[PDB]
Amino acid sequence: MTREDMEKRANEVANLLKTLSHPVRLMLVCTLVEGEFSVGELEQQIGIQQLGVLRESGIVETRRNIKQIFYRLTEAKAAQLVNALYTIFCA
Amino acid sequence: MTREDMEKRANEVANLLKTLSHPVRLMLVCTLVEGEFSVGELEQQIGIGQPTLSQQLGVLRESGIVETRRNIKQIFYRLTEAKAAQLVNALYTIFCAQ
DSSP, X not given: OOHHHHHHXXXXXXXXXXXXXXXXXXXXXXXXXXXXXXXXXXHHHHOOOHHHHHHHHTSEEEEEOSSOEXXXXXXXXXXXXXXXXXXXXXX | OOHHHHHHXXXXXXXXHHHHTSHHHXXXXXXXXXXXXXXXXXXXXXOXXXXXXXXXXXXXXXXXSEEEEEOSSOEEEEEOOHHHHHHHHHHHHHHOOO
């Protein structure tokens, strides 16, 4: 609750902000808060390598069958951050 | 409130996140929600010395989220972007855990 505890968490906080600092990476995470989407559905949703950066960050996971690859948001902190951004930025 | 609306402000959102993506910039903003601090007070608060402190404060000036107050004695920094303060508040709710 204090700035002293926040200071101890800073590198982890700054890293998540770094993961969402790319607009494409932000829109992908914003889509993913609603549920699991295939790569095809995400292309339809965001109208666009960035999923790779997201995989590497560990905030998303993949589900794969013989037909397709599905992306799911696993870091609840990213979803809560994405949620807060709507409250702050929607006008 | 919609993703269509969010998509229209995606570059602005991503820019504020880029400004706060450096841990030093993040600790400076977290300090600055509390009130106005001198460069000297900020050095005492975050435990980072020169040139790092002024280099990161400079990035924050360029972003337009902090302003300066200067007299004959010193320079003071203040957080002006309410969106950054609101983001800081949300980060406390998300990141604080006992």
